[PDB]
Amino acid sequence: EMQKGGVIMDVVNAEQAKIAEAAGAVAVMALERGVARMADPTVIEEVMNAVSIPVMAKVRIGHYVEARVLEALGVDYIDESEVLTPADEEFHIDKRQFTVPFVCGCRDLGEAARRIAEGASMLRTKGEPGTGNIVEAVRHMRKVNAQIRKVVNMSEDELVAEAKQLGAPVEVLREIKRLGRLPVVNFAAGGVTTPADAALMMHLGADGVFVGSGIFKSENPEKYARAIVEATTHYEDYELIAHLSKGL
Amino acid sequence: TDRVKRGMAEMQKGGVIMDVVNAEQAKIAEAAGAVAVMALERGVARMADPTVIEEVMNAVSIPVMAKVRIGHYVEARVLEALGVDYIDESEVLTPADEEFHIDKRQFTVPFVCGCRDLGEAARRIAEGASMLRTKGEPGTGNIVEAVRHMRKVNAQIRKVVNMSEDELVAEAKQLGAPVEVLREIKRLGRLPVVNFAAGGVTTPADAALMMHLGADGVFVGSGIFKSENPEKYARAIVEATTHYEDYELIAHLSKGL
Amino acid sequence: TDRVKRGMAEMQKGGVIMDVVNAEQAKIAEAAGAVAVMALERAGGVARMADPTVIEEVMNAVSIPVMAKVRIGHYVEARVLEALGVDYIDESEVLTPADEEFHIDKRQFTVPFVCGCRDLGEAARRIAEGASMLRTKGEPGTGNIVEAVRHMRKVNAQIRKVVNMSEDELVAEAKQLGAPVEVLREIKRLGRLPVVNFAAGGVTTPADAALMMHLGADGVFVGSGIFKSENPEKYARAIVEATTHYEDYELIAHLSKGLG
Amino acid sequence: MQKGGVIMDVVNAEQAKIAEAAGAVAVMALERVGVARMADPTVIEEVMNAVSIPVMAXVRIGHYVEARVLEALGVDYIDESEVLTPADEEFHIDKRQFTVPFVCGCRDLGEAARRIAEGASMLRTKGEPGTGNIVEAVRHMRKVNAQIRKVVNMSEDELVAEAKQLGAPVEVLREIKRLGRLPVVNFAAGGVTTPADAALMMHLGADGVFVGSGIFKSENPEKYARAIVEATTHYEDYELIAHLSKGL
Amino acid sequence: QKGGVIMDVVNAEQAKIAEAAGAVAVMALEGVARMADPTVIEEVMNAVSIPVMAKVRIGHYVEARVLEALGVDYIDESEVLTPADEEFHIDKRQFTVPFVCGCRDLGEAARRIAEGASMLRTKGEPGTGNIVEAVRHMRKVNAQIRKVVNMSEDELVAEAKQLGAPVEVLREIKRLGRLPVVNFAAGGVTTPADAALMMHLGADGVFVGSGIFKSENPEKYARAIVEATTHYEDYELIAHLSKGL
Ligand SMILES: O=C[C@H](O)[C@H](O)[C@H](O)COP(=O)(O)O
Ligand SMILES: O=C[C@H](O)[C@H](O)[C@H](O)COP(=O)(O)O
Ligand SMILES: O=C[C@H](O)[C@H](O)[C@H](O)COP(=O)(O)O
Ligand SMILES: C[As](C)(=O)[O-]
Ligand SMILES: C[As](C)(=O)[O-]
């Protein structure tokens, strides 16, 4: 199900992976680092052997075989990722055909619903990567959740037209209206840097957060990772978050 | 419940549905071999006076259709209460709602809806339509309207049926269609509901042409009853639609008119 | 005070308000079960407040509330109607606007106003000007219900959005709609508009009237078309019953049989 | 000067007497309502001899000699009027060179100020004529008065720039700021048809109203003229105005 | 507190100088620009008795809650930091601590007030040393206020629509004859003449940046700004105060 309230961390090796696990990450995202492709299987296996929590890796958008390779390696989740160099500009992977669950990116409810119709088991609401700027995450989490609230409360007979306007599959919108939320977990990602950032994303209705390699470029990675984990879990404990922000 | 509604529509294959304004015309249509009649009254065009619809219902044993203005939920509920067999949410009447069609899933009676392309068809189906009418502009006597859209809809269906499974979500986005309807279409090799041609079907050759182009049947308008011999004319359309590849018969049937 | 004007406006839900040009029509409207009447005088030309004589004729003919129209922005026409003892003033877009930019400051009046709106921004601006009741309406005189439907769908969709939206997003929503934020805050608090909102524009058949109620209207306005029918009292009656019993489709079906 | 008053269009002595009897503060002598020019002097003299109240007459915009002719006839006011066919598209009459006072039209404060700089002694704020539609008068009275209120209260050092933006002479703006209003009387005109219309213009800050020949096409001109006069004078007496509206 | 000067400070030493020079408050400060390290803010809070401001990125609700928890006296939802939300500002009504917000015109000012702002900073572009930024916007805001104060009551709803303002805030402005909160100028206030100019243009006070502490004699410079802002019509004094720097 992917533990709601959790933090998923990018790691490039076993050492980083262990630190992430020790800090309380719910999962790790194995990475290698022009054209950006699926990581060398060796690196992924190194990370898989280093920890007991779920390991994700990831593939280029549309790269069906990269995904099958990761599936064969025994990865726990595949991330069909926009930060890698897209392999297909028009068609995403038909994730319904896979055993392993996929996480996909989205910027609005239309994208989210299309990813779900392709078989996505989890979503990452994200704008531009690598900026350290939370505005990317915020813009899109606000958009997606505002659009969800609209759908949840709208007149049933207006959903087909709403679907057309969003570019969404209507059955996904119908499911959203029925549940009062997305039928999959939706984590924030994009520039989540400080403990306050992580808690903010939770305040805005995220189910959890992804954080990048910035953690391991700090002076004390384990303390930093830890602060993000605690802030994300205790996202309304402002005294704690204030205290956690001091070190960094 | 969708299956029963669709099954009712399905049993109409090869058939002709005729517009009638009174009991006399309705009886002629039934006598000529129509599979159903469409009751009409004739500025703003609305649901017909219930009296006229009841007159038609009492005059024949075949199914009676009537319908309502697009989006007019209450007109539809009225026709449902009258015991009509099919409701036609019709673009020739003056639309009551420019943006939202009736949520036809909430009804007991089955609906026929219009469409000009596969995106429209799929949206109508998602709203609960049990039958489709592929049609362009009405009242012209010009078959090009029907042809353009039957060619489009069927060409788009053939594309979907044979396309790579992983390309359907993007296809759906491009068409403005619900992907689950496209998936159903690919599974069945056709639309999951009956699809009749309508728009300018005038001659027996016209009716047979629409069947040649893959229609499941045809709608014909009041033009029939403005001819010198309506029963013969209606008859010719019925036989041409049924025996749409019997060109000697169609040639013979065309002589009278 | 607004609170009392609003309490007066409340006494109209589920009702039909009818246009009448004389005492005879007014009595028929009352007899058919109208909750109020709208007194009117009547091509191309300037349309103004009706002759006070005509309004008094209607006021004397019935016991139900009497409304009359003024031109948009025509402060003095409104004061005149107030002085005549009219029950409601309708600042009406079907009359020839007197002011293209500024509506009447209705807060300064004793008598309650009804105003038109096409979307929630307009509705909220009319409310901030002191409107006690709204009429959601597109183009008039067409017999085409699409006008009413378009705008009732828009207004109610926008209300549902506001009711459920995150509290901290309202100021930006207000900016985007051109609405006063305090009205949006009130809407979110109540779960609906703080005033009654009737449909108007092409309501012709009983099915039309019931449709508007299905779409969330609090009632309907109907025009002079009623009195051009063969049996006005039966027709008016059918609209009244359809509006009240808007989910009774057997009754509505039966009521639709008569009309020409 | 003649505040609260009504000025009435008249085509002959009979109409002029009725206007005087109804309480008009002045009359405007006309020939009619092709090319529209100064009226035949005979018609103007007929009206001048028929009443003791001031008599006005129209000249074409820029028609210096028409104006001199009316001056020589002993007219009390000259109306350099946009409803006549303009003689000069670019330059209005230099009214400073005349003994007789002029009334001029205006649609905004810039125009008003330019007319004043040319020597206008009175203004008529008016849009399109002959419509019976008060919106013309209202639009422009609202504009002129809103612009005046802005000038009256604005920072002194911003006036030169305001003048540039309006196309106004700054000394007129300075005078307006000093007086808190226009230095001349400003009457409304354009579609004033009902007693409510007349009172509305006063509510909007007019100093008075002009009314056209419509009065004499009614069934009872003297009663109608009378109603306009009383409504304009007692513009906040809504019971009276209501009563006055009953007849016609 | 009106007539005052608020000064940017990066440490306890600067904060003490600002307090000694007569600042009414200090603004504690420390690519992407975020809320300052709490340690730096606490250092400044402990160093002085006057109010301390700090901050947060626009829309960053949690940064604001953090500063609230630290015991900061005012939160500055600041456009010079990297915005966290391009569309929605913080709902400041939900907070105990008061906020200052930026504005460039009356529409913005009124929207900030409706969100719960307790103070305004009328400001254009930062870091230029050019007073035109402050002037443009103080002139705009105050011209728009004067218009609203004197305009016909029945025209306010339409004015509000045109400005993008909440009408109830305009109604309040008309009632008071001014903004219902204090409005300080900021943006390129560099010389004593600049500071006094902003007061001449109707500011309630001024913000000044770190430029003060890059001068040869910060305490004298800060002092000159403070005195010029207080005695903004004393041109002999202002002339004298301008000689040093
Ligand atoms: O035959 C199509 C009709 O013109 C409809 O009014 C409309 O164009 C289809 O609506 P939509 O494609 O938005 O569902
Ligand atoms: O029903 C709308 C009226 O015609 C108004 O006069 C106008 O179109 C919109 O109102 P506002 O003045 O608030 O934009
Ligand atoms: O640079 C800061 C800007 O002034 C704000 O981001 C801007 O005011 C956005 O808010 P609003 O849309 O309410 O003006
Ligand atoms: C916007 As897409 C074609 O990635 O669903
Ligand atoms: C525009 As002009 C000739 O009336 O000053």
* Residue D211 token pair: 């009314």
What is residue A38's DSSP assignment?
Answer: P
Ligand in closest contact with the CA of B99 = 1
Residues E184 and E23: their CA atoms lie apart, in Å, by 13
CB contact under 8 A, C150 and B73: no
Q: How far is D130 from chain C (nearest CA, A)?
A: 11
Cβ atoms within 10 Å, residue A57: 26
**CB of B94 closer than 8 Å to CB of B156:** no
Does E8 appear as a known binding residue? yes
Cβ atoms within 10 Å, residue C217: 28
Torsion angle in degrees (nearest 10) through CA of B222, B225, B226, B229: 150
Does E49 appear as a known binding residue? no
Atom 3 of ligand 5 has which residue's CA nearest to it?
Answer: D90
Suggest the residue from C118, C142, C146, C245 to mutate for an interface test with chain B (most B CBs closer than 10 A). C146
Residue C240 DSSP SS3: helix
* Residue A169 token pair: 């599959």
Ligand in closest contact with the CA of D112 = 5
Nearest to D230 by CA among D22, D17, D3, D16: D22
Q: How far is C148 from chain A (nearest CA, A)?
A: 17
Residue type (1 letter), A245: S
Residues C214 and C197: their CA atoms lie apart, in Å, by 13
**Active-site residue, from A58, A126, A223, A246:** A58
Residues D108 and D137: their CA atoms lie apart, in Å, by 11
Which own/partner pairs from C25-30 qualify as long-range (CB within 8 Å, at least 24 positions apart)?
C25/C227, C25/C232, C26/C58, C26/C61, C26/C62, C26/C66, C27/C61, C27/C62, C28/C227, C28/C232, C28/C233, C28/C236, C29/C62, C29/C64, C29/C226, C29/C236, C30/C62, C30/C63, C30/C64
Enumerate residues 6+ apart whose C-beta is below 8 A from A48.
A30, A55, A73, A74, A75
Q: Count the residues in chain C.
A: 260
Does B151 appear as a known binding residue? yes
Residue type (1 letter), E233: E
Q: Tell me, rounded to whole angstroms, the distance of Cα E59 from its chain centroid.
A: 18
Kindly list the residues from chain D whose CB atom is less than 8 angstroms away from the CB atom of residue C76. 196-197, 199-200, 203, 235, 238, 241
CB contact under 8 A, E61 and A203: yes
Main-chain dihedrals φ then ψ at residue C13, nearest 5 degrees: -70, 140
Residues E72 and E63: their CA atoms lie apart, in Å, by 12
Q: How far is the CA of B14 from the centre of ligand 1 (A)?
A: 26
Main-chain dihedrals φ then ψ at residue D24, nearest 5 degrees: -55, 140
Return the number of CB contacts < 8 Å for D and E.
26
Suggest the residue from C211, C214, C220, C259 to mutate for an interface test with chain B (most B CBs closer than 10 A). C211
**CB of A163 closer than 8 Å to CB of A189:** no
* Residue D195 token pair: 């007693």
What is residue E205's DSSP assignment?
Answer: E
Kindly list the residues from chain C whose CB atom is less than 8 angstroms away from the CB atom of residue D214. none
In angstroms and rounded to an integer, the radius of gyration of the C-alpha atoms of chain B is 18
Which own/partner pairs from A165-169 qualify as long-range (CB within 8 Å, at least 24 positions apart)?
A166/A108, A166/A109, A166/A110, A166/A113, A167/A110, A167/A114, A167/B173, A167/B176, A168/A109, A168/A110, A168/A112, A168/A113, A168/A114, A169/A113, A169/A114, A169/A116, A169/A117, A169/B169, A169/B172, A169/B178, A169/B179, A169/B180
The string of DSSP letters for A206-221 reads -S-EEE-GGGGGSS-H
CB contact under 8 A, A117 and B166: no
Strands B87-89 and A55-56: unpaired
A184: left (phi over 0), alpha (psi -120 to 50) or beta: beta
Q: Which atom of ligand 5 is nearest to the CA of D107?
A: 4
Residues B232 and B211: their CA atoms lie apart, in Å, by 20
> How many angstroms separate the Cα of C31 from the Cα of each of A101, C21, C53?
68, 16, 23
Residues D83 and D17: their CA atoms lie apart, in Å, by 24
**CB of C111 closer than 8 Å to CB of C162:** no
Task: Report the sign of the C-alpha dihedral through residues C153, C154, C155, C156, in that order.
Answer: positive
**CB of B129 closer than 8 Å to CB of B70:** no
Q: How far is C205 from chain D (nearest CA, A)?
A: 34
**CB of C242 closer than 8 Å to CB of C253:** no
Residues C51 and C40: their CA atoms lie apart, in Å, by 9
Residues A119 and A98: their CA atoms lie apart, in Å, by 9
Residues D74 and E125: their CA atoms lie apart, in Å, by 65
Q: Which atom of ligand 4 is nearest to the CA of A110?
A: 5
What is residue E134's DSSP assignment?
Answer: H
Return the number of CB contacts < 8 Å for B and C.
70
* Residue A220 token pair: 């004390």
Q: How far is the CA of D16 from the centre of ligand 5 (A)?
A: 32
Main-chain dihedrals φ then ψ at residue B243, nearest 5 degrees: -105, 60
**CB of E4 closer than 8 Å to CB of E203:** no
Question: Which among C169, C171, C175 is the best mutation to test ligand 3's pocket, defined by most ligand atoms within 8 Å of the CB?
Answer: C175
E115 lines ligand 3 (CB under 6 A): no
Chains with 3+ CB–CB pairs under 8 A to A are B, C, E
Q: Could you say which residues from 177 to 196 on chain B have a Cβ atom under 8 Å away from some Cβ of chain A?
A: 178-180
* Residue A107 token pair: 């910027």
Name the residue among C157, C164, C166 with its Cβ closest to that of A152: C164
In sequence order, what E strands does chain C have?
A: 15-20, 36-39, 66-71, 88-92, 113-117, 133-137, 196-200, 219-222
Q: Which atom of ligand 3 is nearest to the CA of E111?
A: 13
Enumerate residues 6+ apart whose C-beta is below 8 A from D121.
D77, D95, D101, D102, D103, D184
**CB of E107 closer than 8 Å to CB of E163:** yes
Q: How far is the CA of C211 from the centre of ligand 1 (A)?
A: 20
C178: left (phi over 0), alpha (psi -120 to 50) or beta: left
Residue C36 DSSP SS3: strand
Ligand in closest contact with the CA of B178 = 1
* Residue C189 token pair: 């608090």
* Residue A221 token pair: 């990675």
**Active-site residue, from E2, E55, E161, E214:** E55
Residues A104 and A122: their CA atoms lie apart, in Å, by 6
A102 strand-pairing partners? A78
**CB of D32 closer than 8 Å to CB of D9:** no
Q: Could you say which residues from 115 to 144 on chain E have a Cβ atom under 8 Å away from some Cβ of chain D?
A: 139, 142-143
Q: Count the residues in chain E.
A: 245
Q: Which residue has the tokens 């010009």?
A: B142
Q: How far is A56 from chain C (nearest CA, A)?
A: 33
Residues D61 and E156: their CA atoms lie apart, in Å, by 37
Method: X-ray
Q: How far is A146 from chain C (nearest CA, A)?
A: 7
Cβ atoms within 10 Å, residue A237: 16
Residue D224 DSSP SS3: helix
Residues D234 and D242: their CA atoms lie apart, in Å, by 12
Residues A123 and A90: their CA atoms lie apart, in Å, by 19
* A and D adjacent (3 or more CB pairs under 8 angstroms): no
B89 lines ligand 1 (CB under 6 A): no
Instruction: Give the 3-state DSSP-derived string for B170-221, with helices as H, strands as E and coil as C.
Output: HHHHHHCCCHHHHHHHHHHCCCCCEEEEECCCCCHHHHHHHHHCCCCCEEEC
Residues C195 and D55: their CA atoms lie apart, in Å, by 54
Q: How far is the CA of A62 from the centre of ligand 2 (A)?
A: 50
Which domains, and CATH codes, for chain D?
1-248 (3.20.20.70)
Residue A77 DSSP SS3: strand
CB contact under 8 A, B178 and A161: no
**CB of A95 closer than 8 Å to CB of B170:** no
B227 strand-pairing partners? none
Q: Which residue has the tokens 């420390």?
A: E30
Residues E159 and E166: their CA atoms lie apart, in Å, by 10
**CB of A30 closer than 8 Å to CB of A81:** no
In the residue annotation, C188 being an active-site residue is answered as no
Name the residue among C145, C153, C214 with its Cβ closest to that of B99: C153
In chain E, % helix, strand, coil (3-state, to 5) comes to: 50, 15, 35
Q: Which residue has the tokens 């012709």?
A: C204
Measured in Å, how far apart are chain B's first and last C-alpha atoms? Answer: 43
The upper half-sphere exposure of residue B201, i.e. CA atoms within 13 Å in the direction of its Cβ, equals 34
Q: Which atom of ligand 1 is nearest to the CA of B99?
A: 13
Residue type (1 letter), E20: A
B133 lines ligand 1 (CB under 6 A): no
B149 lines ligand 1 (CB under 6 A): no
**CB of C220 closer than 8 Å to CB of C16:** yes
Nearest to B40 by CA among B31, B26, B53, B57: B53
Task: Report the sign of the C-alpha dihedral through residues B28, B31, B33, B36, in that order.
Answer: positive
